Amino acid sequence: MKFTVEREHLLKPLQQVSGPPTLPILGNLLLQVADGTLSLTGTDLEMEMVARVALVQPHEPGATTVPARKFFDICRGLPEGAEIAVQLEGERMLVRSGRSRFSLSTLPAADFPNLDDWQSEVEFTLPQATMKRLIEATQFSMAHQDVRYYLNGMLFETEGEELRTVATDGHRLAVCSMPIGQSLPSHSVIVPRKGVIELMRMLDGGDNPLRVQIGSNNIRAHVGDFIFTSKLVDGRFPDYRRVLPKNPDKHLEAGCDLLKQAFARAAILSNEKFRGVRLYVSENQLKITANNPEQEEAEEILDVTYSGAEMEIGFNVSYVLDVLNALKCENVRMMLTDSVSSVQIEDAASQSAAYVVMPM
Amino acid sequence: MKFTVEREHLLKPLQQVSLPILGNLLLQVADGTLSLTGTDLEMEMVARVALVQPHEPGATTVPARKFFDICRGLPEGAEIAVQLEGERMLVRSGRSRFSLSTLPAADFPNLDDWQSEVEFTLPQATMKRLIEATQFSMAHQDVRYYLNGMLFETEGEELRTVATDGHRLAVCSMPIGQSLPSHSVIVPRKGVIELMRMLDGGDNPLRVQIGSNNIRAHVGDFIFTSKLVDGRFPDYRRVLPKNPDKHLEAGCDLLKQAFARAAILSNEKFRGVRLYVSENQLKITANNPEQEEAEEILDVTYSGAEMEIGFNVSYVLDVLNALKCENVRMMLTDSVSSVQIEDAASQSAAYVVMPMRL
Ligand SMILES: O=C(O)[C@@H]1CCc2c([nH]c3ccc(Cl)cc23)C1
Ligand SMILES: O=C(O)[C@@H]1CCc2c([nH]c3ccc(Cl)cc23)C1
Numbered sequence: 001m002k003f004t005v006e007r008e009h010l011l012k013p014l015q016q017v018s019g020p021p022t023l024p025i026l027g028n029l030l031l032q033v034a035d036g037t038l039s040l041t042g043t044d045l046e047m048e049m050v051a052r053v054a055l056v057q058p059h060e061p062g063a064t065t066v067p068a069r070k071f072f073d074i075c076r077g078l079p080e081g082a083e084i085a086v087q088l089e090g091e092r093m094l095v096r097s098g099r100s101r102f103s104l105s106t107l108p109a110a111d112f113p114n115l116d117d118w119q120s121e122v123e124f125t126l127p128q129a130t131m132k133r134l135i136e137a138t139q140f141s142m143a144h145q146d147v148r149y150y151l152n153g154m155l156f157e158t159e160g161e162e163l164r165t166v167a168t169d170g171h172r173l174a175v176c177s178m179p180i181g182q183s184l185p186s187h188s189v190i191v192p193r194k195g196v197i198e199l200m201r202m203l204d205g206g207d208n209p210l211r212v213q214i215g216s217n218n219i220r221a222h223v224g225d226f227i228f229t230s231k232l233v234d235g236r237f238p239d240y241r242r243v244l245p246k247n248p249d250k251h252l253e254a255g256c257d258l259l260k261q262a263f264a265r266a267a268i269l270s271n272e273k274f275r276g277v278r279l280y281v282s283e284n285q286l287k288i289t290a291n292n293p294e295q296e297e298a299e300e301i302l303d304v305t306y307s308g309a310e311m312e313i314g315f316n317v318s319y320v321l322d323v324l325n326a327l328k329c330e331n332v333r334m335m336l337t338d339s340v341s342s343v344q345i346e347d348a349a350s351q352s353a354a355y356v357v358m359p360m
Numbered sequence: 361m362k363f364t365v366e367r368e369h370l371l372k373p374l375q376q377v378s379l380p381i382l383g384n385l386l387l388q389v390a391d392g393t394l395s396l397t398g399t400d401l402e403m404e405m406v407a408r409v410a411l412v413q414p415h416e417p418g419a420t421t422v423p424a425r426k427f428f429d430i431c432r433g434l435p436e437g438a439e440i441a442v443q444l445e446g447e448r449m450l451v452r453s454g455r456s457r458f459s460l461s462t463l464p465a466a467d468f469p470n471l472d473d474w475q476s477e478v479e480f481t482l483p484q485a486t487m488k489r490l491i492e493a494t495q496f497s498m499a500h501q502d503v504r505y506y507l508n509g510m511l512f513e514t515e516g517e518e519l520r521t522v523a524t525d526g527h528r529l530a531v532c533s534m535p536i537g538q539s540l541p542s543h544s545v546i547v548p549r550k551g552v553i554e555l556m557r558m559l560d561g562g563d564n565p566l567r568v569q570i571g572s573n574n575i576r577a578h579v580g581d582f583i584f585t586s587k588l589v590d591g592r593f594p595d596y597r598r599v600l601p602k603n604p605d606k607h608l609e610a611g612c613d614l615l616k617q618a619f620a621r622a623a624i625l626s627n628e629k630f631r632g633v634r635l636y637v638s639e640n641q642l643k644i645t646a647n648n649p650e651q652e653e654a655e656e657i658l659d660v661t662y663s664g665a666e667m668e669i670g671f672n673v674s675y676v677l678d679v680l681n682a683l684k685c686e687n688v689r690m691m692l693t694d695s696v697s698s699v700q701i702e703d704a705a706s707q708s709a710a711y712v713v714m715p716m717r718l
């Protein structure tokens with residue numbers, strides 16, 4: 001196995017396959033030269049990233065595996081415009097560039113683990129920006145290491161011509177739907193949180209569309225010369241329609257950033273553990289208050305657009321702040337029911353995403 | 361106690377000054393001025409804010425982080441009105457209102473009174489240069505408490521800083537245009553850190569006052585006071601190589617990148633790399649317990665006898681990152697002697713690294 005490639009053609013592929021073990025070979029990248037292509041594979045047994053690099057210079061076929069981080073750190077450490085000559089010699093991989101020479105240990109390619117083979121049941125294409133939008137709008141609401149394993153991940157749902165993401169930790173929910181202009185079956189799967197992070201990581205910028213394949217136990221995303229494959233999560237994800245308030249007809253509208261800074265200041269004097277704040281809504285006005293065990297108190301009063309009846313309601317302020325930070329918009333709509341029911345929150349200008357927060 | 365001040369006039373003082381009372385700030389309105397004091401019993405920062413708006417005298421202490429966070433959270437340009445109300449401190453700005461707990465100003469601890477024995481003034485930029493050049497070589501929580509800080513030494517018209525962790529050494533000296541007594545003190549590392557951040561590098565001169573057990577630095581509206589480390593510092597002069605007659609000179613960044621690349625395949629604990637020096641050429645090699653190997657060859661300026669020497673690559677990279685210059689000189693003797701490292705174009709800072717037998 002031999003190849004010579006430009007540093008700049010190696011960097012991003014290495015970065016993509018490198019991110020991230022007790023089982024050593026999982027710390028290695030599989031390198032394959034075949035049919036004028038270098039393939040770079042990294043895996044953790046649950047998910048897999050494969051990058052393909054075209055070889056325009058002389059090369060020889062073969063396969064090996066090398067320490068991922070070390071190989072990446074060596075390539076990144078080399079100067080702008082460096083040319084990187086690699087060859088398998090003995091049980092070592094030789095890396096040469098200029099007068100820099102490196103000899104890395106290898107583990108046999110035959111030892112590199114493969115995911116189980118599977119069949120694609122559902123397929124579609126969508127813009128990179130759309131997938132980015134879907135993930136960023138909901139990602140923050142996924143659970144972290146909850147015993148309900150199905151919540152430590154993100155639902156991806158196809159319905160009509162819409163792709164939808166749902167994330168919830170049992171206390172708050174985020175949902176976002178986008179048109180992708182294809183007739184899709186009605187289907188949903190849960191992608192593990194690590195898979196979601198990796199999927200987000202591969203976009204990227206630029207105008208490369210994303211190709212998605214969904215199997216009974218796997219998801220695959222093709223973008224450019226990268227292929228990401230993940231296992232799915234078992235379990236019955238909650239139905240976002242049961243979480244959305246059935247009729248939240250008390251509509252409050254306020255500047256997103258003004259609203260956020262008011263909640264953030266009030267948050268300073270909220271209970272450090274429970275983070276509770278009270279909202280007092282009345283005609284065109286919102287009052288936010290907070291207090292802690294040591295009798296410290298915050299009060300914020302804002303002008304808002306509100307014509308409904310007056311009500312009081314308590315919330316975990318971090319949850320509200322999460323939502324407002326996730327809304328990169330000018331105005332927010334808060335949709336209320338009563339003092340003991342959840343609130344729906346949306347961008348005043350768009351219904352594409354919805355956020356639900358339970359009262360305290 | 362009562363005052364009304366613009367948010368932005370509080371932010372820098374608050375940043376600078378930031379038992380539970382040690383988590384509070386002492387606030388004092390007196391003679392047209394707001395004073396804010398923070399302390400951890402070892403050191404203290406006092407900031408002064410001129411009060412152009414109507415005010416009423418008094419003193420209290422409030423939670424530092426909360427009060428800072430409230431002020432920083434309010435909108436740019438906001439006016440912040442503060443008054444005492446029983447056991448509480450009221451903070452108002454627009455339609456935002458905050459009631460904070462207080463602890464008595466009488467309970468706020470003071471550093472012991474002391475006499476200034478040695479004094480000098482120097483540009484802030486000079487003090488910043490002195491500390492930056494050496495700071496990274498201070499020990500962290502070493503049993504030898506006298507190394508967990510930085511030596512400040514006066515001699516003739518020069519101020520010198522020394523820092524060592526018992527393994528490598530940094531030294532920096534600058535003339536300051538004033539005749540000084542021959543003296544030296546050890547400033548605790550947290551004190552060094554605080555002093556550093558008190559300096560904007562600007563046009564306000566820095567006044568330093570040193571007592572038998574304390575040091576004080578005054579810059580414009582800020583006064584920093586710290587206890588000294590009461591111990592003996594090692595003599596730096598004994599560690600400098602007697603007569604290093606083998607000077608290698610090379611571009612700092614190229615030298616650094618070569619070492620940083622070779623370091624990847626060096627021992628993770630002991631970080632030894634080898635140098636082979638020959639006429640106008642340097643070869644760096646590294647290997648680890650897995651027998652992975654790195655080699656770097658680069659052009660340098662060198663005309664001395666051919667030699668080989670090993671160093672901790674982490675220590676050398678620290679030096680090269682601190683130097684931030686165009687060209688570096690490595691002053692070599694032999695394989696069993698330490699190396700002195702300097703900016704090729706300045707003797708003001710010098711760094712010593714021990715030899716390694718690899
Ligand atoms: O499977 C579960 O335990 C559900 C997870 C999602 C969820 C449950 N109760 C909720 C109440 C409010 C919100 Cl926002 C989400 C949930 C229960
Ligand atoms: O008091 C001590 O223990 C000394 C601290 C300074 C020091 C010791 N051995 C060293 C070796 C190299 C350098 Cl640069 C400093 C020291 C021992």
Ligand SMILES: [Ca+2]
Pocket residue numbers: 247248249337
């Ligand atoms: Ca209703």
Ligand SMILES: [Ca+2]
Pocket residue numbers: 270271276277278289290291292
């Ligand atoms: Ca509260």
Ligand SMILES: [Ca+2]
Pocket residue numbers: 513514515542543544
């Ligand atoms: Ca002296």
Ligand SMILES: [Ca+2]
Pocket residue numbers: 626627632633634645646647648718
């Ligand atoms: Ca070595």
Ligand SMILES: [Cl-]
Pocket residue numbers: 101102103653654655
């Ligand atoms: Cl080699």
